[PDB]
Amino acid sequence: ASTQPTHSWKVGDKCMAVWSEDGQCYEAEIEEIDEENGTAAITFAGYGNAEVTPLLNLKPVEEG
Numbered sequence: 001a002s003t004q005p006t007h008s009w010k011v012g013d014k015c016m017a018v019w020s021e022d023g024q025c026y027e028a029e030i031e032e033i034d035e036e037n038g039t040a041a042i043t044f045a046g047y048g049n050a051e052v053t054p055l056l057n058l059k060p061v062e063e064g
């Protein structure tokens with residue numbers, strides 16, 4: 001138990017994640033979820049970078 005999910009995420013979903021390097025949000029796809037830690041491994045689309053970031057950092061892709 002680490003991050004208590006406030007959002008329900010599934011593998012292969014598009015989300016926006018906060019890049020650990022800039023702290024800004026970027027579009028990323030969930031590759032793997034760890035519900036215990038409340039984290040998901042996401043891959044930033046276009047760049048190809050991937051990081052394990054808590055579901056709390058994952059935001060829905062709101063196009064506006």
Ligand SMILES: CN(C)C(=N)NCCC[C@H](N)C(=O)O
Nearest residue numbers: 019026027044047048049050
């Ligand atoms: C959200 N992510 C991963 C990024 N915004 N990445 C930018 C740095 C990596 C890029 N290939 C580059 O070297 O420019």
